[PDB]
Amino acid sequence: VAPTALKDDDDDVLLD
Amino acid sequence: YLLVTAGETGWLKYHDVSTGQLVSELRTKAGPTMAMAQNPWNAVMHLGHSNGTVSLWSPSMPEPLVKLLSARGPVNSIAIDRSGYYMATTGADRSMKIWDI
Amino acid sequence: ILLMKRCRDWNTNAKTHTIAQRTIRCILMHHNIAKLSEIPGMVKIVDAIIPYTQRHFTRVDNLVEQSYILDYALVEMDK
Amino acid sequence: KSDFKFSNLLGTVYRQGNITFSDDGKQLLSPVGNRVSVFDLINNKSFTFEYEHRKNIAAIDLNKQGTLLISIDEDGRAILVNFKARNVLHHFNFKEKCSAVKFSPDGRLFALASGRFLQIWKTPDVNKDRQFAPFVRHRVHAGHFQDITSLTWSQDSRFILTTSKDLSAKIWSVDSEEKNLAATTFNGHRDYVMGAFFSHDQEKIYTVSKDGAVFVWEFTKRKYSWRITKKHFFYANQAKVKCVTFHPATRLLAVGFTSGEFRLYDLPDFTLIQQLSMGQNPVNTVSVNQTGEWLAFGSSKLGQLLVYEWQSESYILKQQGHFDSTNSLAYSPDGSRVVTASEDGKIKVWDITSGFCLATFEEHTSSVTAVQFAKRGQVMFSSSLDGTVRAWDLIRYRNFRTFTGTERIQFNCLAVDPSGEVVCAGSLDNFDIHVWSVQTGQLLDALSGHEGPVSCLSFSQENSVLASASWDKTIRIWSIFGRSQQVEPIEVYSDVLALSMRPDGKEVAVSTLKGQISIFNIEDAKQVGNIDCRKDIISGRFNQDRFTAKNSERSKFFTTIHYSFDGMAIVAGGNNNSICLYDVPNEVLLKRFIVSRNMALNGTLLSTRKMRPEVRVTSVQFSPTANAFAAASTEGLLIYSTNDTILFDPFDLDVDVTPHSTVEALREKQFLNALVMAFRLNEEYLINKVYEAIPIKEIPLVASNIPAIYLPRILKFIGDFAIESQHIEFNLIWIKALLSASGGYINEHKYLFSTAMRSIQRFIVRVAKEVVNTTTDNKYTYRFLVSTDGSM
Amino acid sequence: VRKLKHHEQKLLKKVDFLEDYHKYNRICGDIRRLANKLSLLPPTDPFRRKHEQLLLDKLYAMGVLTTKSKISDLENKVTVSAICRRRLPVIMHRLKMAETIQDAVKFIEQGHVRVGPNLINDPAYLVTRNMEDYVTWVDNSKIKKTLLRYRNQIDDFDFS
Amino acid sequence: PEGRWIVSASLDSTIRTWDLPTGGCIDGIIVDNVATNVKFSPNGDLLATTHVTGNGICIWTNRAQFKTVSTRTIDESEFARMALNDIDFNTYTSLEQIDKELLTLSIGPRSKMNTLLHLDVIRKRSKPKELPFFLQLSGEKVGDEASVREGIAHRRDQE
Amino acid sequence: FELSDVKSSKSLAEIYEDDYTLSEELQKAHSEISELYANLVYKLDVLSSVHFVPKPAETPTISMEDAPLYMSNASSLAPQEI
Amino acid sequence: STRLKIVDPYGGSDEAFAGDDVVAEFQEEKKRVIDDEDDKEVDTTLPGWGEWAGAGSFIKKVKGVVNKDKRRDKNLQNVIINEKV
Amino acid sequence: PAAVDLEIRSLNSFEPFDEIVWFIDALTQGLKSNKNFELYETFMSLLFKAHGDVIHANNKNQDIASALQNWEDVHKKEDRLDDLVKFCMGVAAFVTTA
């Protein structure tokens, strides 16, 4: 981590 | 009898005092010229840029004779020894390089 | 369509506008506004009439307001 | 007998520097030349701070607490001012040009960009009493080799990113033991770095260059070091990235390019949310709201300031300043709007309440010299150096008529008849006053009678005589209306420059080159008073001068004068650094005002013209509300108002009169005594207390019994109070009761109640009618929906 | 450099590198180019005819043109001497206020001259045609007193 | 400078601030050395006093210029031993609605209503300012005027 | 109205292409004519002005100046105009 | 280092480098200059002079300014010599 | 101002038109309070602008008419202001003029 730090997939193929 | 200038425009202006006319205009395409130097032995200009590549420039010649990057950081200054054999540079990343032309 | 061409025409004159508005009032109350919107040539006659009615609205209300003068006459008299 | 204080600057929303959003997000701070202007976006109000810098402002910043505002000029001199109380706190000189100033998000520290050095200082505590030497420097950082373009604060007040012209972005640690955490120099950019920002988590650092490249930096294993994981580029054909801002919470990047267009981007995906252009001029400054929904942009060349709501694609603010100095000003008869004219030739209409420009007119080709309203206020008239007089309506915003001379005579002054049917304009080249008919647009005739160029014109509001004054050392009174025309010439010692005419129309005042304000009786054509002004005027030696100011004679005359509507005072201005308020019956100076304190302005203190801006007042007028007066000057329209009223000015006060006694009268239900006693004290808080404590039943009884002497004051108090008050129906009921009981008295003395009646007429017209219009149309819109037969 | 000898002159030429009216020359030329561009535009379109007429009127208001003129005259009538004639010290000399052009400059610098209501300190000011007869002396000029002292018309009510 | 307060110094080594509208002493001070003079600044943010001892001039900061001051009368007995809030702070806030039966508008700018009624037109006025190889050209352009004579002769594409 | 007497750089497909897809150059003249006069006027104005004369000064565009926004074009037309 | 220490009345009471891969960039130019300056074998096949060409169904050396194997900058690391100029 | 008008346009316009009827009842309550009188008036105007056709088509419906009717039992009361304003500017016009 940097020293300056603080401190489903819905498919698009659809039937017609 | 020629004056050379370097700018962030990238354009190198070559002006002759005797004739009072500008010899040539050339854009380095290396970006702003943070360092500028002249080599007495061959009268070939030396320039430093953000990449750190040093491009040698001549009035007659359209595109740089040689391109060499001594340091990763920008070269803030270029020095060339009197004989013209040796060339020294300072990169912005604290790293020194001694070169021979 | 014939009638309102006249009402558009009468409305332009301030002396004869009062007749024009009341005939239009009967039409809208005794007809289907949807059917009026459909008839061709309406909207353009409808277009020309709106500005004149608004001008008559700027008037009359001024005449309504100018009448509040005698109210000042009555209250002054009551003193 | 009223105290005028500078309130706001119209004709001016942005000159240069950086604009900053208030932390609440409801206000926008825009530096205006030598002062700072604050715009209340939610309330649509504006004010300009009274404190003034030596030179034009360079950088400003407001702390998150909203309590301290720091402003630094071009020489580095800083002024620290309490935002809430609007009072200057301390003055400090950093002795170096300060490119940018920004408070820490914690607010304890503020960082200053000075050339090649980052200076970090401790913020003075507001709660503590005025501290003698409050500024203490926490540290100073010297790592860069070229000028710092900007700086950014970490959200935790622990690290600072500064971008310089060294093509590098450098991170510091505010805290010493955390130096090892952030001591890195980011390189790789090909041209000046404009902005370096943190992500919300602060893991990612985004750096942008003027060439148009955005680099995403991440701490990652090749053991771990900062590397450029992703590179984005702006493919502007020739526009250069000039100003940039980032909002970590919503990940919005607003970049203003030199071509005058800006891009809204989403990071790190580099999605172009919107592209939109302000013009052909470089966008000087860009700022983001605290929430991130409002974006402010501005540029200096023409003076842009907009507030853009990218969410809804709506414009919260879009306001403009005059490119040139404003030459003339005219109040609407009620005072709701003021119209300003400039050397450009474009007219602007301004709203006093909002302070924002409703419309702009550009029909005039050349500079507009004079502007005036008709008595109705429905029509607006202007004369320009293009050779035309043009007629404008402010209801529909159209030029309904244009007047021009046969040989295109060059016009400088104008006047409009109270009936609004005759127009007279005046020229410096023709020596005759052209007359036009408003209805027809034809030249009625030309009034000859001067050897000299006509300098000014004005018609009597009531009697309708014309007074024309000129360099001919004389003044003529023209009785054009009537079967026979008569002209009454009156000689004067020196050339007259300005003429103001009493609202009664019985007296006329004139300013001469000698610095004399002479009043003449129009009916008697005899002088009644004279005022000396040469000594009171303050004129500063120009840097180009080779002779002293005291020995100078450049401007000890007043080129503009105007009466007060009460008629007992004149406001006078000229090509000088002073406005003098005099009193007519006694011929004494009431107060004097300094126009500007900018040292850039020339007068504040072989083929090339040594020519620089000069401080001068082109025109001055009294507000018809009788509470303010505006002065047209180079920087803009300066408005001085009497609204604060911190002064104690009792009237007929006695020992028995006391605020406690007034409250006791209310508790005893003796309303009439309480109101009279409250007015005798003349306290706004007390009269408001008594005013709203009166029951509706007792108003008519009280109104009938108010003494006559207090009547003009109560009418004035209702008018100004009612315009912004929410109690529409009480303020009207009092107007009804006061009018019904004292209607005859006001008619007998129209002039005494002229200003107060106008204020009432403003309330009943400019708010009250609009409310009922929205009520009545809905009533009629309803009756159609129910009475009408619905569709099939 | 030192004067080159005869042979040096032949070998090398034009090596001598490294009142001014350049600004006025630029104005005179800049007007000439504008007139040329207007001519390039056709004869019928109304825009330029308004414009060239505006240029004729704009110049005439100064005094560079003593009389109303045509465009083909603007190209040759306009000259640097005309603008110099409109210069304030030159006008003072023609009005005979100052004996010599150099003298007039000092009076302007010292502040004894007024053009209409306003004092002008810049000698390079050109007086436009309608202001040229209101150019006069400031009321309290010590020299304006001398004007009236010899003629013995010095009236001190006017403070002059 | 505001003409509302009087500050007086007395030989009993006390400085008193008197509020003229109510005619009572509001603040009291005890100075070690008697203050021979009392003067307000033209702005009023500073007050200058001189004392029987000391060659300098004492300068005071007017806290009232930074925040409101209560005008409650000072305790006389307590001061000697040492040796309605809206009225107290000289302010008043208008009540939200004086009476229920009587109409009152909203507490805000009056331009809001106009914006609501005409919000639609503001949106419209606030909008920002704006080949195929087998080209299918026929008719008089391509020279078959016979087609034109004999009678033989994209909005949805925009759709 | 003039004819070109040199070889047309465009071939028939290009001119037919041009046909498928009062004069711009004429306005380009007007613009440069306008630019000169503003330069002429300013240069001479500062010579002839007592008081300071300042120098006169894809993507969709926001307009700096708006000649009110609430006002509608229909509402700005008189009944007789309609 | 990297923080100026000033002792004055108002104060004085009490590095890492990150950059782009320049060597990868410079190496790229060295491949471009060598490619442009070496000899080019241009394919002068004219597809279809002697065969059917369509859906169904001669190379020339051009002299370069310098051959890639004859370059001076070859074996010189951190140097590109532009032979054409 | 943007937020309100988006909501007014959105309100459901399908039978039984509960949301429209509910909205009318809310503002009818607002008028009784005699507070924010101007604002509640403008919200009502936007309703006819956005749904006036919907209101007109089904005016015979009892839910719409009853809520629609109750608004005049209130709104008819706020006509005293109309008589009041028409009094002030006329006599003020008379008093200042004659």
The answer to whether chain B touches chain I by having 3 or more C-beta pairs less than 8 angstroms apart is no
Q: Does D396 touch chain G (CB under 8 A)?
A: yes
β-pair type (D109-114, D98-103): antiparallel
> Do residues D626 and D565 make contact, with C-beta atoms less than 8 angstroms apart?
yes
β-pair type (D261-266, D252-257): antiparallel
Amino acid letter, residue D414 = L
Cβ under 8 Å to D: H residues 11-30: 11, 13, 15-20
Determine, for residues E34 and G47 on separate chains, whether the beta-carbon distance falls below 8 Å: no
> Do residues E58 and E114 make contact, with C-beta atoms less than 8 angstroms apart?
no
β-pair type (D241-247, D496-501): unpaired
Q: What is the DSSP string of G37-69?
A: HHHHHHHHHHHH-SS--PPP----B--S-----
Q: How many CB atoms lie within 10 A of CB H35?
A: 11
CA distance D515 to D495: 10
- Chain G nearest C-alpha distance from F128 (Å): 5
CA distance D511 to D475: 11
What tokens appear for D776 in the block?
């009545």
Chain I contact residues (CB < 8 Å to D): 2, 37-38, 41-42, 44-45, 48, 52, 55-60, 65, 68, 71-72, 75, 78-79, 81-82, 84-85, 87-89, 91-93, 95-96, 98
Taking the C-alpha atoms of C21, C24, C25 and C31 in order, what is their torsion angle to the nearest 10 degrees?
Answer: 180
What tokens appear for D170 in the block?
């450098």
According to DSSP, residue G76 is labeled G
CA distance D342 to D366: 9
- Residue D166, phi then psi, degrees to nearest 5: -75, 10
Which residues is E126 bridged to in the sheet? E87
Q: How many CB atoms lie within 10 A of CB E96?
A: 7
> Do residues I24 and I68 make contact, with C-beta atoms less than 8 angstroms apart?
yes
- Chain F nearest C-alpha distance from D759 (Å): 17
State the resolution, in angstroms.
6.0
CA distance D710 to D689: 17
**What residues contact residue D758 under an 8 Å CB cut-off, 6+ apart?**
D333, D334, D335, D624, D625, D719, I96
Full 3-state SS string of D97-112? CEEEEEECCCCCEEEE
- Burial (CB count within 10 angstroms: exposed 0-12, middle 13-18, buried 19+), residue D598: buried
Taking the C-alpha atoms of I76, I78, I81 and I84 in order, what is their torsion angle to the nearest 10 degrees?
Answer: 50
Distances (CA, A) of B32 to B49, D29, F53: 6, 36, 70
Percentage helix, strand, coil for chain H under 3-state DSSP, each rounded to 5: 20, 20, 60
Taking the C-alpha atoms of D133, D139, D142 and D146 in order, what is their torsion angle to the nearest 10 degrees?
Answer: -50
At D405, is the secondary structure helix, strand, or coil? coil
Task: Name the residue with tokens 């602007």.
Answer: D348
CA distance E12 to H35: 46
Determine, for residues G40 and E124 on separate chains, whether the beta-carbon distance falls below 8 Å: no
Cβ under 8 Å to C: G residues 13-42: none
Q: Which residues of D touch I59 (CB under 8 A)?
A: 785-786, 788, 790
Q: Does E15 touch chain B (CB under 8 A)?
A: yes
According to DSSP, residue D716 is labeled H
Phi-psi category of residue D275: left, alpha or beta, with phi > 0 → left and psi -120 to 50 → alpha: beta
What tokens appear for D118 in the block?
């980052």
Distances (CA, A) of B70 to B45, B92, F5, G69: 16, 11, 77, 61
**E30, E34, E128 member nearest G48 (Cβ):** E128
Determine, for residues F121 and G63 on separate chains, whether the beta-carbon distance falls below 8 Å: no
Task: Tell me: cis bond preceding I16? Omega within 30 of 0 counts.
Answer: yes
CA distance D497 to D517: 10
Q: What is the DSSP string of F94-149?
A: --S-S-TTS----SS-THHHHHHHTHHHHHHHTSPB---SS----STTTT-HHHHH
Mutation test of the interface with chain H: which of B44, B67, B76, B100, choosing the one with the most H Cβ atoms within 10 A?
B67
CA distance D81 to D84: 9
User: What angle (nearest 5°) sits at the alpha carbon of residue E26, between those of residues E25 and E29?
Assistant: 85
Taking the C-alpha atoms of I74, I77, I81 and I84 in order, what is their torsion angle to the nearest 10 degrees?
Answer: 180
Distances (CA, A) of D114 to D111, D119, D144, D743: 10, 7, 11, 68
- Residue I12, phi then psi, degrees to nearest 5: -60, 135
Technique of determination: cryo-EM
Enumerate neighbours of C (3 or more CB pairs within 8 A): D, G, I
Q: Which residues of G touch E58 (CB under 8 A)?
A: 40-41, 44
**What residues contact residue D726 under an 8 Å CB cut-off, 6+ apart?**
F94, F104, F105, F106, F107
Chain C residue at shortest CA distance from G76: C51
Counting DSSP H helices and E strands in chain E, the numbers are 8, 3
What tokens appear for I37 in the block?
């009188």
Give which of D297, D175, D190 is closest to D233, Cα–Cα: D190
Amino acid letter, residue D720 = D
What tokens appear for D358 in the block?
């409703």
> Do residues D11 and D322 make contact, with C-beta atoms less than 8 angstroms apart?
yes
What tokens appear for H15 in the block?
């590095």
Distances (CA, A) of E118 to D590, E123, E139: 27, 14, 12
Q: Does I29 touch chain F (CB under 8 A)?
A: no
**What residues contact residue B69 under an 8 Å CB cut-off, 6+ apart?**
B51, B52, B53, B54, H22, H23, H26, H78
What tokens appear for I17 in the block?
């038109």
Q: Does D266 touch chain G (CB under 8 A)?
A: no
Determine, for residues G16 and F128 on separate chains, whether the beta-carbon distance falls below 8 Å: no
Helices (H), D410-549: none
- Residue F82, phi then psi, degrees to nearest 5: -60, -40
Chain G residue at shortest CA distance from C55: G79
- Residue I62, phi then psi, degrees to nearest 5: -85, -35
Determine, for residues G48 and E125 on separate chains, whether the beta-carbon distance falls below 8 Å: yes
What tokens appear for D336 in the block?
């709701």
Q: What is the DSSP string of F27-38?
A: EEEE-SS-EEEE
Determine, for residues D159 and A4 on separate chains, whether the beta-carbon distance falls below 8 Å: yes
- Burial (CB count within 10 angstroms: exposed 0-12, middle 13-18, buried 19+), residue C27: middle
Task: Name the residue with tokens 């450029």.
Answer: D228
At E107, is the secondary structure helix, strand, or coil? helix
Longest dimension (CA), chain F: 123
Mutation test of the interface with chain H: which of B28, B51, B89, choosing the one with the most H Cβ atoms within 10 A?
B51
CA distance D301 to D280: 10
What tokens appear for D349 in the block?
């209409």
Amino acid letter, residue F156 = R
- CA G36 from centroid of its chain's CA atoms: 14
Using the Cα atoms of residue E131, residue E137, residue E140 and residue E141 in order, give the sign of their dihedral. Answer: positive
CA distance I68 to D787: 12
> Do residues D724 and D697 make contact, with C-beta atoms less than 8 angstroms apart?
no
Determine, for residues D166 and B92 on separate chains, whether the beta-carbon distance falls below 8 Å: yes
Determine, for residues H10 and D188 on separate chains, whether the beta-carbon distance falls below 8 Å: no
Give which of I2, I3, I8 is closest to I27, Cα–Cα: I8
User: Alpha-carbon Rg of chain I, whole angstroms?
Assistant: 17
CA distance D78 to D604: 20
**G17, G62, G63 member nearest F135 (Cβ):** G17
Q: Which residues of F touch D724 (CB under 8 A)?
A: 110
At I66, is the secondary structure helix, strand, or coil? helix
> Do residues D588 and D582 make contact, with C-beta atoms less than 8 angstroms apart?
yes
CA distance D412 to D468: 13
The answer to whether chain E touches chain G by having 3 or more C-beta pairs less than 8 angstroms apart is yes
> Do residues D552 and D538 make contact, with C-beta atoms less than 8 angstroms apart?
no
Ranges of beta strands (E only) in D538-616 are: 560-563, 569-573, 578-583, 588-594
CA distance D469 to D478: 11
CA distance H63 to H38: 8
- Chain D nearest C-alpha distance from I74 (Å): 12
G18-22: long-range contacts at Cβ-Cβ below 8 A with a sequence spacing of 24 or more?
Answer: G19/F137, G19/F141, G20/F131, G20/F135, G20/F137, G21/F131
CA distance D532 to D582: 10
Task: Name the residue with tokens 């080129």.
Answer: D559
CA distance E143 to E150: 11
- Residue D138, phi then psi, degrees to nearest 5: -70, -40
Q: What is the DSSP string of D173-222?
A: ESSGGGTTTS-EEE---SS-EEEEEE-SSSS-EEEEETTSEEEEEEEEE-
Amino acid letter, residue F68 = T
Chain I residue at shortest CA distance from D769: I85
- Burial (CB count within 10 angstroms: exposed 0-12, middle 13-18, buried 19+), residue B16: middle
Q: How many CB atoms lie within 10 A of CB D705?
A: 12
Distances (CA, A) of D233 to D240, D241, D272, D275, G54: 11, 10, 12, 15, 37
Q: Which residues of D touch G78 (CB under 8 A)?
A: 396
Helices (H), chain H: 22-37
CA distance D100 to D536: 41
What tokens appear for C23 in the block?
């005939």
- Length of chain H measured in residues: 85
> Do residues D4 and D579 make contact, with C-beta atoms less than 8 angstroms apart?
no
Longest dimension (CA), chain A: 52
Amino acid letter, residue D413 = C
Q: Which residues of G touch D398 (CB under 8 A)?
A: 76
**What residues contact residue G23 under an 8 Å CB cut-off, 6+ apart?**
none
What tokens appear for H17 in the block?
């480098």
**What residues contact residue D131 under an 8 Å CB cut-off, 6+ apart?**
D90, D124, D125
Helices (H), D492-625: none
- Length of chain D measured in residues: 792
Chain C contact residues (CB < 8 Å to G): 12, 47-48, 51-52, 54-55
Q: Which residues of I touch F117 (CB under 8 A)?
A: 42, 45-46
β-pair type (D347-351, D357-361): antiparallel
According to DSSP, residue F153 is labeled -
Chain C contact residues (CB < 8 Å to I): 33, 61, 64-69, 71-72
Which residues is D207 bridged to in the sheet? D196, D215
Task: Name the residue with tokens 């003593």.
Answer: E66
> Do residues D665 and D674 make contact, with C-beta atoms less than 8 angstroms apart?
yes
Q: Which residues of D touch H16 (CB under 8 A)?
A: 183-185, 225-226
Q: How many CB atoms lie within 10 A of CB D615?
A: 24
> Do residues D21 and D288 make contact, with C-beta atoms less than 8 angstroms apart?
yes
Q: Does B1 touch chain E (CB under 8 A)?
A: no
Q: How many CB atoms lie within 10 A of CB E53?
A: 11
Chain I contact residues (CB < 8 Å to C): 56, 86-87, 89-91, 94
**What residues contact residue D676 under an 8 Å CB cut-off, 6+ apart?**
D706, D707, D710
Determine, for residues E122 and D608 on separate chains, whether the beta-carbon distance falls below 8 Å: no
Chain C residue at shortest CA distance from G74: C51
